[PDB]
């Protein structure tokens, strides 16, 4: 069967599901979400951090953070239709990594059409920020 084209709230919530699910299970395959013009940031040294670009730089960055036994408590997900068939996603929740402290954060995603296939999106912007490192 064929289904109607989904709203950004649906696209930007199924992605959030797939994102943190993969981040817990196969974090090395997380780089599949990105492209050559994608940006990525986390922060924590030492002047929070600057962004990285491309599937190669992002993957090496993800592996540097060691996402082992990753647990996320998603509290609220906002997903609106942004410019030119894009979906801006703001995520608010808790994150625990390496069996340590549960940390509050906010995250901003920008999902853009691949062109390419039927209704497939890729991450253009990935902005993560731990709150305990800001306020």
């Amino acid at each position: 069967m064929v289904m109607e084209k989904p709203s950004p709230l649906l696209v930007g919530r199924e992605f959030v599901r797939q994102y943190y699910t993969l981040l817990n299970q196969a974090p090395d395959m997380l780089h599949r979400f990105y492209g050559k013009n994608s940006s990525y940031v986390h922060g924590g040294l030492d002047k929070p951090a600057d962004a990285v670009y491309g599937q190669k730089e992002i993957h090496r960055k993800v592996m540097s953070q060691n996402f082992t036994n990753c647990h996320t408590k998603i509290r609220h997900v906002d997903a609106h239709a942004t410019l030119n068939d894009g979906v801006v996603v703001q995520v608010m929740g808790l994150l625990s990594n390496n069996n340590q402290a549960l940390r509050r954060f906010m995250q901003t995603f920008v999902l853009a059409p691949e062109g390419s296939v039927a209704n497939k999106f890729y991450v253009h912007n990935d902005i993560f920020r731990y709150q305990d490192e800001v306020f």
């Binding site: 989904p6 992605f15 797939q18 599949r32 296939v117 497939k120």
Partner: peptide, 5 residues
């Protein structure tokens, strides 16, 4: 590439 949905 990205993800399918």
């Amino acid at each position: 590439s990205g993800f399918s949905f």
